[PDB]
């Protein structure tokens, strides 16, 4: 249920792969969910219907 991708710091977006296609969604603006490092991991959780762009590198 989790779909991984990479985030854009400038745009605060997550690009993730699901069902053969790349999808670009906004990250949250929350302090510890936003995209902090360009091109680092993000995930769309299709169970919870949430996005997180702040992972440990
Ligand atoms: Cl595509
Ligand atoms: Cl969200």
């Amino acid at each position: 249920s989790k779909y991984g991708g990479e985030c854009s710091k400038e745009h605060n977006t997550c690009t993730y792969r699901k069902d053969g296609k790349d999808h670009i969604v906004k990250c949250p603006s929350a302090d510890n969910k936003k995209c902090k490092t360009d091109r680092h991991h993000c995930e769309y959780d299709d169970h919870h219907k949430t996005v997180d762009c702040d992972f440990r590198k």
Side-chain angles (χ1 to χ4, degrees):
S1 70
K2 289 168 180 286
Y3 296 89
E6 293 74 55
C7 73
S8 164
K9 187 174 191 279
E10 182 172 352
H11 303 297
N12 205 27
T13 59
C14 179
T15 300
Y16 65 88
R17 181 72 61 86
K18 175 169 182 289
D19 296 329
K21 299 177 224 291
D22 284 342
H23 305 253
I24 308 172
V25 298
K26 280 287 298 302
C27 301
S29 54
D31 291 341
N32 295 309
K33 295 185 176 180
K34 65 188 174 180
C35 186
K36 317 209 145 174
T37 303
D38 195 44
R39 296 292 300 168
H40 285 237
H41 192 69
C42 60
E43 88 176 8
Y44 172 60
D45 184 327
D46 198 38
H47 172 80
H48 292 118
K49 314 296 185 181
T50 60
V51 182
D52 192 348
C53 302
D54 187 22
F55 282 77
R56 296 162 285 186
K57 68 202 188 187

